[model samples]
Each structure stands twice: as structure tokens, then as C-alpha cells.
Target: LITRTQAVCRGYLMRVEFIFCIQYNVRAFMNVKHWPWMKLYFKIKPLL
Candidate 1:
């Protein structure tokens, strides 16, 4: 029972941090009018 859960957990942990970085950047730089990362955020959200 544990081995399967462990592998799945690891994948989710990495995915969480990957998205966290995007959210953090978008939130931190929200005021910048021409920031290109915002477009990336929108694109990734739906793709994921």
C-alpha cells in the first residue's frame, strides 16, 4: 500500500512547488504593467 502512495506524493510535491513559483512571481510583480510573466501564468493555468 505504501510504495504507490510514496511515488504519487513525490510527484505532487514537485508540481506544487512548480506552480507556487509562478503564483509567487505573478503576485509579487502584479503592479508592473508590461510584465510578460503574466501571460505565461494565464497560459499555464489552463494548460495544466
Candidate 2:
């Protein structure tokens, strides 16, 4: 008995999960510096 809004939210969550999986796969071959940048892009920001 999910509402329309609930359905849309579930879809968005699934899309984010998929993107995270793809990024993890891609990062496996990246150098350390580039990996740091990717982490920042994914909101692993500094506290400053």
C-alpha cells in the first residue's frame, strides 16, 4: 500500500545505490590521490 511519493523515493534510493556500486568498481583501479578526490565528490568532506 505504498503511496506515489513513497514509490518515487524508493526509486531514487535504488539509483543512488547503483551509482555507488559503479563508483566503487571504478575506484578499485584508481591511484590514491584520485581516490581521495572521488571520496570528496561523494560528500566525504572535511570538517573545516
Candidate 3:
């Protein structure tokens, strides 16, 4: 019963959800040393 536009929207939502889940898991294992910007943000987070 779904129209083509509805189906595409559903697929896009699923793709975004999948990417979010992957990013969450990947962040758990990420090395802060490799990303100086992230490291700096973390260091300054407590001061702000």
C-alpha cells in the first residue's frame, strides 16, 4: 500500500538510523590521540 515516495522516505530513515548506531559503537573504540581537535574539546569541556 506504500507509495514510491513513502518507500524512499522509509529507506532514508533506516539508513540514518543505521549510520547513527554505527557511529555510537565506533566512538566507543575511537582513539582521542589521533584526533587532536576532539582531544582539545575534551580538555576544555571541564573549564566551560
Candidate 4:
């Protein structure tokens, strides 16, 4: 049940991250450095 809750929390976080990136404006180039890890999270999330 805790694991399920973690996944639910992460889904909320993923949405927050999507919008935060936009409001963050174009520091996007620097942010790209972090995206690979996030991309992996995106991929891995569904399995959870």
C-alpha cells in the first residue's frame, strides 16, 4: 500500500515537474542535463 502511495505521489510530482519546467523559462539548456534521468523515470514509472 505504501509503495502504491509512492507511485501516486510520483505521478503528482511528474505533473508538477512538467509545469515547473515551463514556468522556469529557458534555463532549459542547462536543465537538459537533468532530463536524461527524468526520462528514465518516465520510462520506469509505468512498471510501478
TM-scores, all candidates, are 0.33, 0.34, 0.34, 0.36
Candidate 1 lDDT, tens digit per residue, 1-48? Answer: 699899999989999987899999998777675668976888889987
Best of the candidates, TM-score: 4
| lDDT score for residue 17 of model 3 | 91
Model 4 TM-score is 0.36
- Model 4, CA-based lDDT: 0.84
> Judged by lDDT against the true structure, how good is candidate 3?
0.84
lDDT of 2 by residue, 5-48 (tens): 89999999999998889899778756565666677866755554
lDDT by residue for model 3 (1-48), tens: 569889999999999998889998788767546778877888898998
Residue-level lDDT for 13 in candidate 4: 100
lDDT of 2 at 2: 65
Error of 2 at 9 (Å): 0.2
Off by over 4 Å in 2: 19-48
Give Cα-based local distance difference scores for all models.
Answer: 0.85, 0.77, 0.84, 0.84
